[PDB]
Write a protein that binds this DNA or RNA. Sequence first.
RNA 1: UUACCACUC
Length: 739
Amino acid sequence: QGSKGTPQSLGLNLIKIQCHNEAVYQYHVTFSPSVECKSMRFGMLKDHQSVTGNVTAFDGSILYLPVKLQQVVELKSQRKTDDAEISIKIQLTKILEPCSDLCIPFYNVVFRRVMKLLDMKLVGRNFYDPTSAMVLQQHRLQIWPGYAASIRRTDGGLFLLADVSHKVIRNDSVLDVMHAIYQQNKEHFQDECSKLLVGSIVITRYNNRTYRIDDVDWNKTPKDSFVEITFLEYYSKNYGITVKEDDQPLLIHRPEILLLPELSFMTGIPEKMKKDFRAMKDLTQQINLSPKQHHGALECLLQRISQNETASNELTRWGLSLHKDVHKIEGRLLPMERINLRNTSFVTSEDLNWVKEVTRDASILTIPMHFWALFYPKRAMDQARELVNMLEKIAGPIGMRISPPAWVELKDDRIETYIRTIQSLLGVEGKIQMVVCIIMGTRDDLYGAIKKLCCVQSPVPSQVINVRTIGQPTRLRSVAQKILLQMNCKLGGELWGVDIPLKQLMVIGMDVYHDPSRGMRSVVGFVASINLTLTKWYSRVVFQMPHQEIVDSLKLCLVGSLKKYYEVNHCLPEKIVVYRDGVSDGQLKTVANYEIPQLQKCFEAFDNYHPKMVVFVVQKKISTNLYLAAPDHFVTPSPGTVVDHTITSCEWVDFYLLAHHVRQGCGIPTHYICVLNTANLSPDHMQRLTFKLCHMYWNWPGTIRVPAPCKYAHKLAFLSGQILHHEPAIQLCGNLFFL
RNA sequence: UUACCACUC
Ligand SMILES: [Mg+2]
Ligand SMILES: [Mg+2]
């Protein structure tokens, strides 16, 4: 493994588990005659709990024990109803190590029992403590603390991963929300109530079970009956809840699920609070915890487990013993890179942020702007004028030459007026390089119309600027510089670069966009390089339409990218590096076994072309946290920290990278898993190439979480899936029009 | 869109 970097003393949120047993014995059971119910099998195995011992993990046909029984054992048992004799035979199958891959499930069951005996409650998959709820009465909210905990196996052994998680609950019932909407709205209250109810998840506090309501029933009432018994008697018998008023509607969830609203409480952060800033600033102050508080919470959980004798007894029945502190590993801090502009290059500073340097000095490639149009409304003449003025002053240091725009004043802020004016100027003047539009307020339909026209119907680059951004006089130079850089990227310019250390290399990045209603046309983006310096990009989009498979179209994208690379370079790439992002944890085998070999066959179209290839799988939603071990307490790790041991997977070759700057909280790295390495790349070269590619995002002067092409593909898929609903025009795919 | 870490009924 790699050895380049500074040795950084790191701490983890993982607690090591020591196994005191020597082996775990797997047995198979047979029933004669046959018995189908699992409960009956457990009852017979419970009569046979004797002999077999009192520590059992039985799932229906496979039995796990910690005691070595004979090779074959026969037992006779009494059937409950027929009063018959049933023979149960238990036979050894194989001997597993305590830290084996097949022991994880029933170990997780044991740990669920352990945490349940600590008075904790299970909502979803995490364990929350409702007695320590923290009430924001100013907002009528409750924050329930808890942990997401699971036992896993890694190269370094058996570990328990625990992460602090908070749940948001509403103090008021959903019936109270219904009454409020009925109060402030008289006629349209049904539609608004349905709109609020559908997306939101709901719980029931008497049983702490979560349902996702999709519809609301208006006709039935608690007085009615259901599968024959009534709701009121049912609830007053099972729980004795005295219902105050019985005129309420019902709630319908479909996987029927019929719930009452007085007994139902919504979840999730409120919709209104997201737009508020003071509210979210306070909630962020309360929820996100520093590394010191996170470690304190983990230590508190461990202390709580240790001080409880029954919880520890449930673990030591299998010879397991949690340690008294988190696991401390050693990571490496990777060396920094040189960011190159046209005439100067700078050592990236310790902050991994270079916003000033880009604005000060010139870019690799600049496209002169001589013919461009500015479409501004009646009430933004002044600010718009001011904007243009600054665009002329800031342009010189960057090295851009911009002429005055073609001023077009829109007589009214109607969407059709915008579209007609833009189309008319497009038709009359065929030379306009860029259309800049100024919009009043928040209008998403206008944005959709503008981008649909400029990207699909008529292929011209477009930019949208909101009046609030350019209205504030104090912040206009800085925003003008970023706007001009974005326009330069859209025209086909090149801003900065890094020194790529492998020759004849082509980088491909993919990412997948899923609709919030995921049963839709899922979009897969594709961004590849067509330049030796990795500054030009060829981008395509493919859709998951029914009755065909996506890999077939990915082949067309790959072969087209190869042809464009040949046009630019008069050769074909020796090494092709593919960054596959967006795949879940349960499809790694599917991607590695099927998709990558399928793509590899497209290369036969070019005669006698066998490229070396490295394929990665990128995962962002990991639950591992890193801490830096300062002499005083736990702080944020430095950007650029790599971990390649003691938490990696034992099946693949993989590593964890932290490349961005965490302003507050514990760092969450990115997991890179290599499924194909035909090029025989050393691990260190893989790590440093990924870290370099994290610097090539031209829409943010600084390092990002994922490689640049993955982010570009994600942005293209998002644009093509939500805003455009259609493939972009082929003419625009040569440049990064989608920024 | 200036741009980013953000066994129920
Ligand atoms: Mg993604
Ligand atoms: Mg943009």
